[PDB]
Amino acid sequence: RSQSEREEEWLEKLYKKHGDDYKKMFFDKKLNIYQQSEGDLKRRLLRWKKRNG
Amino acid sequence: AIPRERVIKAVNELIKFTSKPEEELKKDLQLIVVNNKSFTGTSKSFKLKLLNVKHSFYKPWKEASATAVKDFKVLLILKDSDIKKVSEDDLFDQLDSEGIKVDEIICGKDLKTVYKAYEARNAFISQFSLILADDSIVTSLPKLMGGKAYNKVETTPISIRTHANKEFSLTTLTNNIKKVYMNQLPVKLPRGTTLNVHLGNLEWLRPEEFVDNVELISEQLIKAYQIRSIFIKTNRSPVLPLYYNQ
Amino acid sequence: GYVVCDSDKRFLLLFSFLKRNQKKKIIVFLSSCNSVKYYAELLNYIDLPVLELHGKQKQQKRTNTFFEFCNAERGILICTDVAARGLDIPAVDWIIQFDPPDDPRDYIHRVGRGKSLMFLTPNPLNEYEFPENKIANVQSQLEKLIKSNYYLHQTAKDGYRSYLQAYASHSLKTVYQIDKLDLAKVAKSYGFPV
Amino acid sequence: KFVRAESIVAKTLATSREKERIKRVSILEDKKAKNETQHIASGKDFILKITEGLIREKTTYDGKPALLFIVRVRGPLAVNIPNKAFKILSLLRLVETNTGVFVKLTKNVYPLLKVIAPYVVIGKPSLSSIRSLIQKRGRIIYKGENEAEPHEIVLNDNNIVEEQLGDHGIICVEDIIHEIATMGESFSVCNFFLQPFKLNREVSGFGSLNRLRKIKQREAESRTRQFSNAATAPVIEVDIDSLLAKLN
Amino acid sequence: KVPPTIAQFQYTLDRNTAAETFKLFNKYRPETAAEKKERLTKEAAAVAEGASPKPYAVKYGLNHVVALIENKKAKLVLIANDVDPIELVVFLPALCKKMGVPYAIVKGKARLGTLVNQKTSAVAALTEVRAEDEAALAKLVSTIDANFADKYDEVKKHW
Amino acid sequence: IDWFTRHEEVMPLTAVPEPKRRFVPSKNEAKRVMKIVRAIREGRIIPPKKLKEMKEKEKIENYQYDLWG
Amino acid sequence: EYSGIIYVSRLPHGFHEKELSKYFAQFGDLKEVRLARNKKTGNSRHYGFLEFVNKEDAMIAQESMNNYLLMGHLLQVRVLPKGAKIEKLYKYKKRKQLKDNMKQKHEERIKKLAKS
RNA sequence: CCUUCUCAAACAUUCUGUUUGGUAGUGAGUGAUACUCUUUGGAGUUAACUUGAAAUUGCCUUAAA
């Protein structure tokens, strides 16, 4: 089970902007539109870091 | 030209008068009152004479507004062409490089539809302190932003050149906003004979620098205007005769 | 000793007294450990560098970060009545208690080691004045902000649900549920009191 | 019939813009003509053209005499015209909506042209649009049988052209078009000879399509005509040629 | 003879106030089926190749409105008088009076339908508003409370 | 006699938490777009800008064909 | 009881005696109307008095315009008690010898820093 | 149920500077010592603040029916 094209490209935007600051990442408004928790974003980034860098 | 030493004896004796055992404005507001044989007597202008100043009192005003209660905020009024063109991120990228910061840019539209209520307009305007306005619409504003907003010297807008010979460019505004911010001081022009120059924050203006600001103003007033009498005044002190023309 | 204020602008006055006083080691005392999640989360998001102490976090997480205040010079922490009990720092000047305390009797005894004022609508030292038109107009900023994030909306909610429970679970005959809920919601800035 | 209170204020406040609007223009071109520039807005003549992406080529105006055809429009909403605009529109006899006239643009004509700008639309026409206007609409106020002149009726003939004007070389209706397209000396006499041009209105009806086509076209006026309300407002020119296809 | 909670209707909002109510309400149309569909195809054509805030509209379901009053989220509530089962809406003016949400009985059910992309609506409410129309909305609230509520305080009585 | 309603209400009649679905921009329309993305990925649907281009080539070519021979 | 003079208040900006006289002519014959204006600049303080000649006709108007929403803000209107006539709302519109004293005044002023 | 002066000039250009001109207000109310003026009549002025757009009287036609 992989992730979608938009999801991957959206995660690229978050990683390049903040890095690994999940608190800043979920208090962000422009990139993290759907106000997901720290646990949601980091889990999806872990899956992203497996397929990519 | 005025002597430097009377101004030093003017400012530091007011440092005495301010060092005594509303208070946000009475202690803090260095102002200087200028008189004329009839300033602009027959026409009710609203321009702001942007007096060239060597050393800013706005980067000073930037800090102490964080320590005091009211936030110093900067407005830009634009026409329709530019707001659709330019964001705050482009402003922030080329003004935080100094460290000045446009909080809100406001269209000419927004003054008449989403702040058209007198209550909300007074709520919107009275927050801000540096009101800047692009030249195409500067001349339309007292219908828009009300007459109450022109009673102050903060809230009255400043015309600022944003067009690079008939066409707008961001480069034109970016160095011009710095020009008004750090180098310029407003003063209005009543059709009376009395005029004050609210010079600024008495917590700032290290008073050797303050005399540099006062004397430089007196250059740009005596050359541009006939004048009668000049007075420095912390807010309702005894008035101090600095200069005496005849 | 105290400052008389209505429930609308109780929080709005507090934000004024913090911004005007930004050099001194000052302490607020609030009731709920749930509540000082809320007032900490606003002030870092309306940008005052505050500190936060409450029961809902770990021990050395609480301790080592409380340790940062004790060696500091400037800033401010927000803590509960309970977690700060027994651990007064002599390096402090303002103890403002927002709430009626846990024990009102034994509260005066814990002063004398630190200047005090409280906040009360109907409910030694003197009061202070307050010029009423000086409070910060951030309630326009906050009402947009309480609607936009949902985390800040949730923590506003728990900061309200837990505020009034503790207000009912108190000792005194004076401090018993007379207060109108139209205005305590405005201390946490709602349109409707949840 | 009864008047709602909404009306009389809206009419008040709109005309008391126009009472304020032309006052400023009447002060300005006074100071432009009398040449007392110490405090003016602008120091020259402006004519802007609006055509098609919706181009706005603002121009100057030299002294070169040009030919303008002006159509009466019915704008704006609640505006009883003041005394100063009753006159110009009566001296151009444009008191009926959807009625046109050719005039010449001089530097005597241009300052009065800023008066009536919100009430009409102006512009430079083409020779086809000059010609196809006249040979398709044309009124001649001339004597009837014996008594009743004011039957304005029709440019039927070329010998009625011989009758009234005649001696100025005015021999046929095509020769009139020479006197209008080219600035001739007897241009004003033949301009006084063809008094209106009763253009039709575009929408011209109520109905199914007609309600919709009215709404769809009414907003099109709001783009192709802007009301400047400025002291040195430009005079706005539209293409007459595309307009006359809508009006002939 | 009519029992007072029936014929609390028919004593409806007058000519000018109703006109001004629709002057406000017609600004806040829900996006129609055609308009919504074309917008999403615009979104499909754009987002597939290469942000928006919450848009305000009127709220128009009976269940949705009876939720919103007592939530409390409703500010103005319009109520049609002509309803096939009258008992569907008889409690609703009392609910608004109890929760303190400003209400107005409007005349004509199809009149509500026009502003809402439906045939009939029986009830319509405006929960939230754009900032420019906020002062106008609150003025209409006072206008309706002066005309409707204060004139007909005795509407709970008299058969 | 409007007896109970004279005492005007204060808190809402429920206490239900309000979900995150009433804040971050909505899934439903976001799901619906993704489907219309899917269909144009499969090409079942043309974008509206090319449909004008389908109507630009069409509808000018009217009455422009032989009918007798 | 109620009298003839009316208290039309809360008037929209741009609504003067003429339109006050014109619109309230529609109810019947009207006695006399003013509108209270600022003296310094000729603009309105948004409350004005008029009188009908028929005391019947007055409370016709009050029962028709007491909360009548009119381009921004509803007119509040009042019949008045007996007597209490319309009074005084005037129609206002937008309406080296020296060097001796200044030499005196420049030297007089220096005493003030010595005063404080 | 109207919707409000969205830039002119001059010189010099770096891909924009310098200079000049252009803005006649919702109302009410509070209020900090100074400035001028003429003449005791008050006039023009100079900080600041409040406020639901608040208020109880200063001597043209097709936007037709």
CSV table of C-alpha atoms (C1' of nucleotides) in Angstrom, one decimal, chain H residues 39-44:
chain,number,residue,atom,x,y,z
H,39,U,C1',-11.7,93.9,19.3
H,40,U,C1',-14.6,92.4,23.7
H,41,G,C1',-17.3,91.2,20.4
H,42,G,C1',-14.9,85.8,19.6
H,43,A,C1',-12.2,84.2,15.3
H,44,G,C1',-8.7,81.0,13.2
